[PDB]
């Protein structure tokens, strides 16, 4: 019966509770917020999809190796004559993600951008987490 | 075993092929593009989530009772030093949706907006599709 | 046991009864005739695989939003000394497909070609089905 | 769940990897290429379906009791305005089949034809493989 | 257990509720009334099996692309001494079928015949539905 | 999967091989021929549905307690332009039923009628099979 | 696991114990002896496959409505140097079939032939079993 | 459900497609033709059951280590009054078997006999395949 | 239920029919005869377990790449007072194995020994099968 | 999946751990050593299969109603050039069986023989275990 | 069905996505790179299998308790005449592993070697992670 | 439960016994040795992954259409203080593969290289196996 | 679900109730007490693991062929501040095992030792149980 | 089938691989070594069962929050006359456990004892891990 739900393509609504994730990193939180972690040698780039969110409704906090993204998207306002006959868009207003990074970061030098509903965060690595090349042979 | 995939929360990547949908309306297309159809008495409002898409990469076409949304989102550019250690964001570049509306529309009077990665389309109904009140008793 | 048949790769023979198909378009008919529908802005291109068919045995009819392809392929002639020890080729002689297009077409301006067993049909769209760009914002 | 895929009639795309086949003969290769082997007393006829292939893109090699068919079909070219809304045609470009014949053949006397996307190969049997009648009683 | 019912061959009684059917055409109705749709270039022929029905108890209505067949068969009359020890004949008296044709028809020129319990309906196609030959190459 | 076939309502075609039936009587034969046996005190009435059969193509034979019904229905003739897009009508031409009656009959006094595709047979009981009332108390 | 045996094609050896059969007639016996019963109006023809049986080893007995076929086939004699590396032929020597015919026969007028390992028996029907035509209407 | 078919004893009809067999030897072909291979030191004996076949309708070909048996049995001829009420005999007319022997043979010295529907073939071994005794200790 | 038999440890009796085996080599035969093939550069060593077999009852034949082992072990003789209350020893008297070797051998130079119920066969390789070292780099 | 192992015929290797056996007698031990117990009136005969064992490596101990068989078979010695490409022979070197006999025996009068890898032990019964005839009626 | 894939021995290709591993240590990354962690008292040895990798294409980075191995192996270059008929070698070019060590290391003193496609890394433990013996009793 | 093992990614250790493989070619042997066969027109290229193997421990033998690769990799040496806390590397020391090529080769002209733990073998085809082009039409 | 418990490795706690064991010997008792029985020719050695038991809390009793081991281990004493956060050690205090030996013993000459929590018992065999060598041949 | 193993009570042998354990603490290692962690306010007590281990064969190392226990138990020595007829004692010689404690410890002040095969370790907590009382209200 679990395929039957997959055949409905209700996946964005029901199947997005990000209680946990294990890939060497820990992601927890509530709501729909797809994440991409890009690791460089000197920095970390985090990409979060926040469609329908205004820049001012984003709380972006970091310390050490943990990053917090808190956001609220206003729900779709409808006049009384109007009615939602079809919707795949999640109704959850308050969403947040807590990302445990693999590396310690300098939050004082971090930067972020919000374009087209995409948040791009630049997190410089702390020197303690900057790796060093082992010379081969 | 189908739950095991749901436990991975890979739903946005794998579970978004919108081949079909039946609610009195027909939705077909390729990629991840959540839709909300809001029906008023005089118009139709369509909400599409296009995070990571620039306004210029959107093709918005309509006629009669069918609406076409075509978009391409540039993939996440990474320097050679950088590597994607974690990602839930779909990599599909070209996405489109073909929506068969329940009502005939005046495409010549339609309007659209793109804010925070959300496309909001206003489609006035054709008079032929504007309903009329039956007086009760 | 259904995999056991898939392990035989008898798929072209048994698994080609195209009774129905739902992708916003309707395909019905009998026999093996793979289809590709390419939608442009002004026209529709249909690709049909008709290996073993002579050009003269093809009936190509269209009207409105429906296209009919009727064909007969002569079966493999064998001398009495000869015998078919192995075959994956379908024996069905008369094949046809009825395709319900998403758009109304001008059958009077349509054109077709038959090369290497491939039928390519060009179907101009009726102006009533030619979509118009909604200007974004 | 395996029937569910059969109900989609995606058989030509997914179900055509001809890794092996056992009928006294060995067929191996890659792609979609239905085969019919017709055995006569003096010769062998092989029928291969190569729709969408030009005669010049066919490599036809034989020796002893093994036949190699190598072909590439150019994929469906689409203008940027055009998009493939529906397709059952395999996209694989390079296809080949290696057929192990039951009989040794004289490749120097073999002949082939390509009409309507069908390859018909005539392979005379080597005298060593031409059978002889046992007189009954 | 579903085979066990098939082993009883009670199929004509239980298994004839024609709520729906999808082949590019829509068939709905109540009772046992096998249908055959024969499509020509200029007309449509419908065959319906109405055993036990008098010609006068048939209501045959059509318009556009929809055909209605309504009939009532009188049940088997039995004297009080008589009793039905065995029966496979459906007892349903009122039967009807609503057939959605693929083509628009000229109901004003239609004709029907009733022989041996078989209804044969001739439905000329409307010019709007008469297809036209695409010239190949 | 057996329900899936029942959902197709293909029951009249596939599910009508009347190899056997056990109700105190034996029915055997080939094809689709629904039967009703009505037992009176003095006679037996058999109802057979023979839609599409001409009176002259019916062979009706009886002796003792066994009745044979043999019939052939001409298949649906179609012009070459015409094609059967949909059919639930069985194609089997030759049909027969062998009914083992519970009672011995006087075949020399039997009578039959054929109206609206229904065969009604009157079979007087032999005196040896005419039952007699036991007086109660 | 029952298919696994069918995949061995050991069916002639294991799957031929003809303990019972119900088609309005009763077949019982031991061994491999395929049967065909052909019913005419005046006679009954029985076909039995007795490969490897000499005419003199056949016992053919009949009375009333029952036919007995008893036969013994000598097993394959092998010299001590010889060994049976492969065999699908049943080893059972003594085989018999008891056929309960639907009709009473005149055994005194019956005839039989044995050619190519096939027994063809002609059994005239007793007048008591010769059926009579009911005149229709 | 596979046992249910075995309970019908339809094994000779359905379960005789001899597509393959693996015992150190390869058997392929079509139809019902039980085989026994008897290996001697100097020769090979093949037993084939061809009931209902005339000697003249047998094609017996061999070369090297492969033997071909091709036969056609005329189907059971029935007068129009006659009808096949019961049959276990396969209706397939054209049958053949291709046997890959373990040893190379001298087809020029082979002999065959046809008695009681049994074909017995004597195939002398080629000296290259005649084995030699290893002396023990 | 298959484990239940394994729990009986009846494996030597029931589970020893060596119809086939695939490891690049072919083993066929009847009875219990464990085999070990030891491949050297110049020769092949075959080990067969023939407990209860006298040296004189062994037939050891080879040619080319095939080896035949035929043996008969006399069954356990028991006086009439004696009775077999327990036995795991197979009762099969005649056993044989046909081994298809990977290499061609010189049967004229082969040797064998029989000690403690173990047959050890030395088979020199034919020069055509003696491999040659590829020099690395 | 347990049949899949039986299809490998690995039974002699894996399926021979004789931890227990219950037939009125107790058999325990390690390794492959098929046993037959033959009970006479005055004695007990035990047959053990010890292929590949030298007479001197057998420890044969008995007392009362228990018999111990301990043996070691040297493993197959292979030169470094040689390699075991195939083997069904168990590699276990040390094997033993402890047999609990149903009867008390005189170990001082017991005798044994070792021929062709078969151990035959004669165990006279103690008078206390020699049974006596009950006279019937 | 999961065993069926294991029977193909496709394990190196499909079954090597090292998303996670839990043994007191964390291993993450992409591609095929078998790892062995050898813990000493003073150092850590890591063994990685990098067949087909040149020494210069290896990026070896470490810090604290985490080790990064990044490598790219050039894919198998084939001339156009050449074709890969069989392959078990993974095609993935870019592979990496991130190993979370149980101990903190002195990356400034680490050393590595690359021989025969094996990377051996020596990682001295930081004094903070060098354990100390508890004296027992 | 078979997925549970796949979730451990123990595939390189447990799932590498290459007893057999069927793709028109035969691969047998012991241990972990991924293979790629590249077929050209004139030669055959074999790629084998032998990480951790010294060039001198490789035995490379070929003849006709069969190739033998024998290798031993020294196991990971550990000091007594050292212990293997984690390992995915197979411990098997002696590994070999026997590859049955589709073509006969000239072993006297073959060449091999060993770089980065990869063995690349060049095997010229024998003229008898060099195929010839059939001219098309 | 039974594997789920095995995945917890709670086996020492839950899975140690030694109610019975059958190997020719009988073991019964309560608690965790692993046993090894070593049989010599003249004596029996029993090894019991009694970790956490003082020598004085052991009751060791024997007679004939039965041995009793009774022990109590004081539970882990914890101060009120202390709490058991993790434990795999069984809490059962009173444990005992009753071992039925295969041989009669001289308890008056038995000896035992207790070192490192291991009880080693030496049990001389009674002469009645000392076995005697059967001379072979 | 998993219960069947539990019914054997082989749990101490098979079911003791302590690859992982999650209770806020991490336990890894090899072999059978039951653990109890007792947490006090100021210290940590670890109990390990090491039956059959001499005090000198124990390596006890700690640092920070991780404890290593390495031990080897000599296997049960048996004279050649002696044989292990029954054993539940694990044969693994080298065992170790790595325990990740919840608290940081002062290894320089730790103490251990070994009595009756039980290791009791006292680990004072580091002041950084000594908790402090929150005053309630």
């Amino acid at each position: 019966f679990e395929r039957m739900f997959k055949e409905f393509f209700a996946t964005p609504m029901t199947g997005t509770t990000m209680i946990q994730s294990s890939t060497g990193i820990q992601i927890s939180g509530k709501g729909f917020m797809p994440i991409s972690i890009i690791e460089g040698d000197q920095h970390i780039k985090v990409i979060a999809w926040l469609p329908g969110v205004n820049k001012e409704d984003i709380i972006l906090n970091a310390v050490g190796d943990t990053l917090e993204i808190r956001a609220k998207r206003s729900p779709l306002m409808i006049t009384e004559s109007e009615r939602i006959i079809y919707s795949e868009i999640p109704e959850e207003e308050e969403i947040y993600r807590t990302i445990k990074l693999p590396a310690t970061v300098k939050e004082e030098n971090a930067s972020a951008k919000f374009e087209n509903g995409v948040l791009s965060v630049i997190l410089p690595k702390a020197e303690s987490s900057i790796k060093k090349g082992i010379n081969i042979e």
Side-chain angles (χ1 to χ4, degrees), chain A residues 13-134:
Chain A
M13 286 183 67
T14 302
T16 62
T17 56
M18 194 59 52
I19 304 304
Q20 281 298 275
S21 181
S22 63
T23 312
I25 55 91
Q26 281 192 332
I27 300 162
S28 69
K30 192 191 173 176
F32 168 90
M33 185 196 294
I35 304 294
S36 301
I37 293 101
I38 291 97
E39 190 181 12
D41 287 359
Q42 295 281 327
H43 72 67
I44 300 190
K45 167 93 88 67
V46 182
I47 314 304
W49 271 6
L50 274 44
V53 177
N54 311 265
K55 196 209 294 296
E56 300 77 12
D57 300 337
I58 300 173
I59 308 302
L60 194 57
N61 296 122
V63 77
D65 71 329
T66 170
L67 176 75
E68 194 191 18
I69 297 155
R70 270 183 288 147
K72 53 198 165 67
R73 52 169 70 102
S74 302
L76 309 172
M77 295 302 303
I78 66 184
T79 299
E80 290 68 20
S81 58
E82 303 183 1
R83 74 214 76 104
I84 305 175
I85 70 182
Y86 187 82
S87 193
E88 307 162 6
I89 289 176
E91 310 79 354
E92 56 238 17
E93 174 164 5
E94 195 73 31
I95 69 189
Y96 74 98
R97 283 286 186 291
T98 314
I99 305 107
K100 196 199 181 300
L101 306 171
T104 297
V105 299
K106 303 191 291 180
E107 61 281 357
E108 66 278 9
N109 301 128
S111 60
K113 289 175 177 178
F114 194 52
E115 294 119 5
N116 310 143
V118 181
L119 187 65
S120 301
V121 196
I122 305 296
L123 301 156
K125 279 175 170 181
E127 304 287 340
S128 62
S129 290
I130 292 174
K131 304 196 176 175
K132 302 194 184 58
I134 317 304

